[PDB]
Amino acid sequence: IRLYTARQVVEQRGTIPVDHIVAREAAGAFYERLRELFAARKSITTFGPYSPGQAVSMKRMGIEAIYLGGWATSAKGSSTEDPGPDLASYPLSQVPDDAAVLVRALLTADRNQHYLRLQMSERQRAATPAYDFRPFIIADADTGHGGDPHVRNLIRRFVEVGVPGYHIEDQRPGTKKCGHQGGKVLVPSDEQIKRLNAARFQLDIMRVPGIIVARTDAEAANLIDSRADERDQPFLLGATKLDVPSYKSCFLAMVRRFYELGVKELNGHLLYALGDSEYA
Amino acid sequence: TPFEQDFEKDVAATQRYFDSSRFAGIIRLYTARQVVEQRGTIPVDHIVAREAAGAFYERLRELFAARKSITTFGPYSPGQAVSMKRMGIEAIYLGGWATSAKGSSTEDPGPDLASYPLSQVPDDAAVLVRALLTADRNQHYLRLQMSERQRAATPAYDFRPFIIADADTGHGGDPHVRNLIRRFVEVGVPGYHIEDQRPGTKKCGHQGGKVLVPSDEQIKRLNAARFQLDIMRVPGIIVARTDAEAANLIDSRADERDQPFLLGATKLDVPSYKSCFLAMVRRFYELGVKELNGHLLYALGDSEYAAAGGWLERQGIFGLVSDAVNAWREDGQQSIDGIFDQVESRFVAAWEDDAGLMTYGEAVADVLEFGQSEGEPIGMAPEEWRAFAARASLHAARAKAKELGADPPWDCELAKTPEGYYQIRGGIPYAIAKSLAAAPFADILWMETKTADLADARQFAEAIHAEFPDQMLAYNLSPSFNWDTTGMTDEEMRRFPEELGKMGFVFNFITYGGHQIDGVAAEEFATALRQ
Amino acid sequence: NLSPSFNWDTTGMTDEEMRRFPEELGKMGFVFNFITYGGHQIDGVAAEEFATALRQDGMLALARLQRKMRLVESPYRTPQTLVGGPRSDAALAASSGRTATTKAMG
Amino acid sequence: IRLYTARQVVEQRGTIPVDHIVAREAAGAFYERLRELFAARKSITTFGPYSPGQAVSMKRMGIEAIYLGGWATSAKGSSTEDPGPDLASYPLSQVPDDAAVLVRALLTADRN
Amino acid sequence: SMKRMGIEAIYLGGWATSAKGSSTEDPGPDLASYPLSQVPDDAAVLVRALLTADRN
Ligand SMILES: [Mg+2]
Ligand SMILES: [Mg+2]
Ligand SMILES: [Mg+2]
Ligand SMILES: [Mg+2]
């Protein structure tokens, strides 16, 4: 389902022709291959390469496609980004920039392989394996790094450097926790679907049949940032004893007591303006 | 041990820094120890940002005390920035509007959606800082070749990087804010502004759909920024912007400080705004307008669709939908864009009218006024209730109203947008409330304004200064605000900047002025070359 | 190439000779002739002028700029349109299935 | 005169299709226009735009083509390059990076 | 990892920089034909990693 028309796509495209041929052709062949494997109940088993050489080696060893994730992108950093944990707090250009290196390595490996194969005899070619360096990549788009214009920008940046596949997850950006059992925060399904739909819109504009992967984090999620979506509402937890003061007010009253008893470092209650009656 | 001593020494130095007059009245939600444990052992120093921030802040304090101000604009090139300083403008603004318009080698230019990567404004600022430092090196080289008399005769320009740059909404949560501030500091920028909008919701050419975040979220952005600046030992200038003057929506009802401004329905048999909107779209679809399929974004139940349909029928909206589809057919089934927009406008007006939208404070006031008119004994005076409601959480307001035997029907859930955003009473009072909450977490406060109006500015400034008399302010001047259709005299326009300064607006800026003059210059030169 | 730093007024050329110079180049098969860093120069002059005007005449500096834009019907008079506001709004409508709220109540 | 053969070009290209459509189509039409002007003993008279807006404005005012020079690129600098004189001492990516901004502005102006 | 294992200093060469490429530079042989920013940009990543490891 697209929440827009063909006319709405065309009116974004202008008059000067563009063509994202690497992403377009890779996406076509990659999708067909995945459909083939699905029909046969077979699969590709891969890993995230950490260097262009790793990506090329994977294809030489027979692995048919490549994963690229934000965890490793965070760990690697860049000339302006300090390495760190998987918070998707890098600029939204970060994973596309990393993917661009992999695509260039793959296309370059293809050029170098072909150059050598042109110098071979027909029998030598039949005897010597030719590796498949097509850029079959699914890359991490995190939560889309904001709203629809962020999603579209991120997808655009992936497509421009030749990436045919992208994954978007139903988390709230900027809430990722390290080494905690709680505090994983979802967004409503309408917000997630609009990310997926925005991605499709951008791919359509660019004439790239890119592969959209929808990830859910609901298996271990604890929280959601809105109660508005009907599809989330069956999973909402509520109090049934309505004379119990709010969780929030109780938490803040507890912190304030620590503070008043002399633990000056616990001053987080000063973030809020809770009234006297509610504190009481 | 040496290890423990080294740590305790930096903690002590960091505490002295925290306690210095620079940060009088600022609340940090963390300790000196929490800063020091982030810093490692290998020394770093962001000397350009650190020294610029010190001198810039002192100058702003000086101007504030004298009720004077800097009036500046956003340079669109490094040359513009150097030129401004040569002409005697003391500081520089850098905004996201112009950054969006300019694009980059990988970013298409476009509208001000802050949808560029969060590196975008820092990268633009880096060019300006390098230009300023380079201008200083070149000026000094030439001045060293001069005689003493030549130096006394020839003006030396001040190329110090006194820049306040746009950090938008912080481009996410605390790690995004800290990353953005880090990137600014590393390239020498001493000042940053953060606004209380929800990222990814900016609208182009609409009177609605401006979406705020709760004050706790905004304050945490400001606090995260201070934390990063503290780690980096840069006394950077934090500017807290509020968009509440013209905001329509907020993405949460959870913060007590926003709750007095929430709008709720007072006629509770009206079906939800959301369900009515979706039922309207679904009717267009079912009547054969396949392009209006937005209702397929949601999974609304049959009972809710039916109730919303009942309302749309009764109010004549389904009549308007029928008329609209017939007109669409008569016109050859082209884009429904304009026809749909017109029906949507009528729908919104009809829903608002029937729902009886007001604040909870207004709803209770109506009940108390009625009691008074009926000659029932007053539990509290109208003005007394309004004063109470203005600073009360919804919980506290309801509890107090219940004591007074005023329990009016009021439901802010019914009035939520399809996205799930709450409607709020935007205006200068809301801007004041958000800004007062932010004041202990920021060095400068700014109420975003569309129109240049001294009375509006005064209302804001006087309200802030009643609680925080030492609070420096900043004022934006939109390049697209038509000055000539205000009817202001030439002299009123001349005096406007000075008038701002008198009210404690110390740093006032024509956001994308550079972009505008760049365009005019190019048009003129291209025309002249051709002719 | 036409150097921006070459002093045209000290050539002794008439105004009309300066007007005709580009056409004269074309007649000799110079098909593409260019003032190399013209943009840099006009950028500088524009900034000097505006900064001076702002310091001297406050917001009248902006009013005068706006007047010039109206006079020549520049697209800079509606900057939000110039940078693509309308097409971006249409992209939001497509991305959200026209469910994004743009109309106000109050 | 090319000092190489068609075979020498093809053996560099690999097997995975690429297409630089914007440069390819612009170069075709631009060259044809210059040949037309040359035949008519006419010319384009232009200047180096210092911003994307300047480039878009030039085209709006009817200038048919754009120059981009190293002098201005040196003067402008970048986030990592100090501005300075025309020494072509910037990294070789510098003028292409500046040109990329102009191309994006032009394509975007066309879309809008 | 090198520093964790006790190696006291680090080398960074153009051969490997050429082999790695970048978002705009195709990988290839050691011709030092990358922009002159290329090896500094690669070194910047290493310095940030080292300072970050120290902080952690
Ligand atoms: Mg991720
Ligand atoms: Mg303050
Ligand atoms: Mg040159
Ligand atoms: Mg070397």
Residue numbers in the entry:
A (entry chain C): 38 to 317
B (entry chain B): 12 to 542
C (entry chain D): 487 to 592
D (entry chain D): 38 to 149
E (entry chain A): 94 to 149
Could you share sentences copied from the article?
Isocitrate lyase (ICL) isoforms 1 and 2 are key enzymes in this process, through their roles in the glyoxylate and methylcitrate cycles. Each subunit comprises two distinct domains, with the N-terminal (residues 1–590) and the C-terminal (residues 603–766) domains connected by a flexible linker (residues 591–602).
The 766-residue ICL2 monomer crystallised as a tetramer, with four subunits forming an elongated structure (length ~200 Å). The C-terminal domains from two monomers associate at each end of the ICL2 structure, forming a barrel-like structure. The association appears weak, as confirmed by small-angle X-ray scattering (SAXS), which gives an experimental scattering profile that can only be explained on the assumption that multiple conformations are present in solution. The activity of Mtb ICL2 was measured by a nuclear magnetic resonance (NMR)-based assay that directly monitors reaction turnover 15 and a fluorescence-based continuous assay that relies on the reaction between glyoxylate and phenylhydrazine. We then tested the methylisocitrate lyase activity of Mtb ICL2; no methylisocitrate lyase activity was detected with Mtb ICL2 alone.
